[PDB]
Amino acid sequence: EDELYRQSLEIISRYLREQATGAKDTKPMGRSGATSRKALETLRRVGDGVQRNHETAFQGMLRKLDIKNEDDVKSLSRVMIHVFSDGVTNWGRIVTLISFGAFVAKHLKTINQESCIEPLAESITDVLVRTKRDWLVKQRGWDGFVEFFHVEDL
């Protein structure tokens, strides 16, 4: 039903799955697949950098959240709600959540919780699309994401 949900889930799931399994999903994208490819490409470049540049904090947050089963993923939806509780929404926060999602999904695979990556990607999508839809739509959705992080030429 919700295209934004679908597309967000597609992008976030692919990134999380791809980051956890190390395998890029060759399966074409659904709709707004141009956007989603570029969003995923953007997610890789920015997301991977977030995980590298904030790996110590991500490890700390991961140890703190202690995400080890599907239930624990709820605890992450809470944290993502907490992210936005100051009323501020921006792509940096959003990509950081997704990046942390990928960080968690990696850890999830090391512990036979690959089954939790889809819930994980789901909860991230849900938080974003359920609670920040208006902002997302206002930012032109994943096109705004791609543009926001687009590396301009000289």
């Binding site: 920015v46 977030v50 904030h54 904090a57 700390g60 947050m61 703190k64 959240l65 809470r78 944290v79 993502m80 709600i81 907490h82 992210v83 936005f84 509780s85 100051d86 501020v88 921006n90 792509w91 940096g92 926060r93 959003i94 990509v95 950081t96 959540l97 990046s99 942390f100």
Partner: peptide, 16 residues
């Protein structure tokens, strides 16, 4: 610290 706050701070950095 609270993970959310921490995440927001990182996010606001990534936003730059």
């Amino acid at each position: 610290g609270q993970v959310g706050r921490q995440l927001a701070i990182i996010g606001d950095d990534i936003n730059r």
